[PDB]
């Protein structure tokens, strides 16, 4: 999920303010990526032994 686009639809007026909350935008991607990365590790170890 792209925080920048989700929160602020395609508009810099909102995009500027989002910069003030810092990593809240990014670290979510890190969280979600953290999920989606291992989601294939699940299927990895379950099915391919």
């Amino acid at each position: 999920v792209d925080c920048t686009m989700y929160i602020c639809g395609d508009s810099t007026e909102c995009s500027n303010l989002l910069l003030q909350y810092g990593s809240f935008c990014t670290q979510l991607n890190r969280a979600l990526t953290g999920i989606a990365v291992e989601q294939d590790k699940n299927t990895q170890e379950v099915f391919a032994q």
């Binding site: 792209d2 920048t4 686009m5 991607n29 990526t33």
Partner: protein, 44 residues
């Protein structure tokens, strides 16, 4: 597009793998906007 990922890892060493660089968007070409005043009834 390669240089923008190294700014995501903050490292000059980039480990073998796939990394997600900033998203891209397609941008709009143009805007599409979609009675009559009785000047034929006033002026004529």
């Amino acid at each position: 597009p390669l240089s923008e990922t190294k700014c995501t890892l903050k490292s000059f060493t980039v480990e073998k793998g796939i990394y997600q660089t900033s998203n891209f968007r397609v941008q709009p070409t143009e805007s599409i906007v979609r009675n009559l005043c009785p000047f034929g009834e006033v002026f004529n």
